[PDB]
């Protein structure tokens, strides 16, 4: 899961709003699956 800088900001933004509802974060990140974002998040936080 190699997020671009824009994907990181937007994931952080979505996380600060819905928490770990990875379905809702992924809907805002084109091309990324809910698990990709979960995978990115655990390895960063």
């Amino acid at each position: 899961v190699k997020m671009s800088e824009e994907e990181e900001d937007l994931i952080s933004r979505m996380y600060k709003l819905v928490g770990d509802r990875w379905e809702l974060i992924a809907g805002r990140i084109p091309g990324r699956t809910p698990e990709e974002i979960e995978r990115y998040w655990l390895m960063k936080h």
């Binding site: 709003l17 819905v18 509802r21 809702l24 805002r28």
Partner: protein, 169 residues
């Protein structure tokens, strides 16, 4: 900032038939910094009492404040999520299309907003998620007025003039 903003935003966005409008206002404590001032949501979702259709905008703002602490997030369309996530944005001097409109004093008409370079538009991925193709910002009433739509709209300054007249009523 200005009086009757919520209603003027509603009248103007409904008249031009775009997806949303936002008024970015300058922080009272941080000079040159823009924050979400108000907005009208005119997009898709899934009357004599509310002739301007203000309710969904109010509910989206309510939900944002709840989450930032009637609608549940699972109910929101792609464009509603765009509109709600915009409320979290703050723009430093010259940053993004709103900060650039404030700093250079001129309208910025962004086509292909879904793929705009980050130096020009800080919300391209978010726009892509909602198929938001056109975003326009212009300095107005000491802040910046932003309108956006899912359609591709060729540049037409009469759209901006229409919004401005519906404010200076």
């Amino acid at each position: 900032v200005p009086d009757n903003l919520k209603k003027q935003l509603a009248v103007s966005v409904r008249n031009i038939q775009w997806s949303y409008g936002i008024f970015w206002s300058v922080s009272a404590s941080q000079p040159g910094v823009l924050e979400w001032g108000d907005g009208y949501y005119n997009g898709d979702i899934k009357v004599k009492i509310d002739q301007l259709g203000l309710e969904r905008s109010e509910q989206l703002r309510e939900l944002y404040e709840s989450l930032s602490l009637a609608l549940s997030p699972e109910d929101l369309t792609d464009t509603e999520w765009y509109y709600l996530v915009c409320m979290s944005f703050v723009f430093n001097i010259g940053e993004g299309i709103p900060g650039g409109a404030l700093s250079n004093g001129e309208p910025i008409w962004l086509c292909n907003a879904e793929t705009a370079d980050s130096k020009v538009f800080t919300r391209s991925l978010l726009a892509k998620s909602a198929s938001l193709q056109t975003v326009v910002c212009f300095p107005f009433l000491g802040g910046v007025l932003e309108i956006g739509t899912t359609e591709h709209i060729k540049e037409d300054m009469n759209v901006i003039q229409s919004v401005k007249t519906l404010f200076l009523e």
